[PDB]
């Protein structure tokens, strides 16, 4: 949550959102094979990610589990898990294929992995 980082918010292909959660997520692959992580914050930093998204015309989509999941298993500049792999490139398919306001609700099209989940979950 710096400075340096709400500075590469412009470079995002897409924030993953929905306490608030948001997370930047760009794909280049001269760099990586997976999508990455430049920016990412919870509540009010959540909201300034979005709102310099916006300001660049950013798409931002809703889709809360892929959303959390993300930001609790990736670090600034970091890849996404592969289990994480098809649920982002879906959602950058949808995004690179819009044509030329609240968040695109997107439904995930399968389960986000259970080792991926259950961040805050009491377990007995």
């Given at each position: 949550?710096?400075?340096?980082?709400?500075?590469?918010?412009?470079?995002?292909?897409?924030?993953?959102?929905?306490?608030?959660?948001?997370?930047?997520?760009?794909?280049?692959?001269?760099?990586?094979?997976?999508?990455?992580?430049?920016?990412?914050?919870?509540?009010?930093?959540?909201?300034?990610?979005?709102?310099?998204?916006?300001?660049?015309?950013?798409?931002?989509?809703?889709?809360?589990?892929?959303?959390?999941?993300?930001?609790?298993?990736?670090?600034?500049?970091?890849?996404?898990?592969?289990?994480?792999?098809?649920?982002?490139?879906?959602?950058?398919?949808?995004?690179?294929?819009?044509?030329?306001?609240?968040?695109?609700?997107?439904?995930?099209?399968?389960?986000?992995?259970?080792?991926?989940?259950?961040?805050?979950?009491?377990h007995h």
């Amino acid at each position: 949550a710096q400075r340096r980082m709400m500075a590469e918010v412009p470079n995002a292909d897409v924030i993953v959102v929905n306490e608030h959660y948001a997370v930047a997520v760009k794909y280049d692959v001269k760099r990586s094979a997976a999508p990455f992580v430049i920016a990412k914050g919870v509540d009010d930093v959540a909201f300034k990610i979005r709102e310099v998204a916006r300001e660049y015309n950013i798409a931002i989509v809703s889709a809360p589990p892929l959303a959390r999941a993300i930001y609790h298993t990736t670090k600034l500049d970091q890849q996404i898990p592969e289990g994480l792999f098809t649920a982002v490139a879906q959602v950058l398919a949808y995004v690179f294929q819009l044509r030329q306001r609240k968040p695109i609700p997107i439904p995930l099209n399968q389960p986000i992995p259970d080792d991926l989940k259950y961040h805050h979950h009491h377990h007995h």
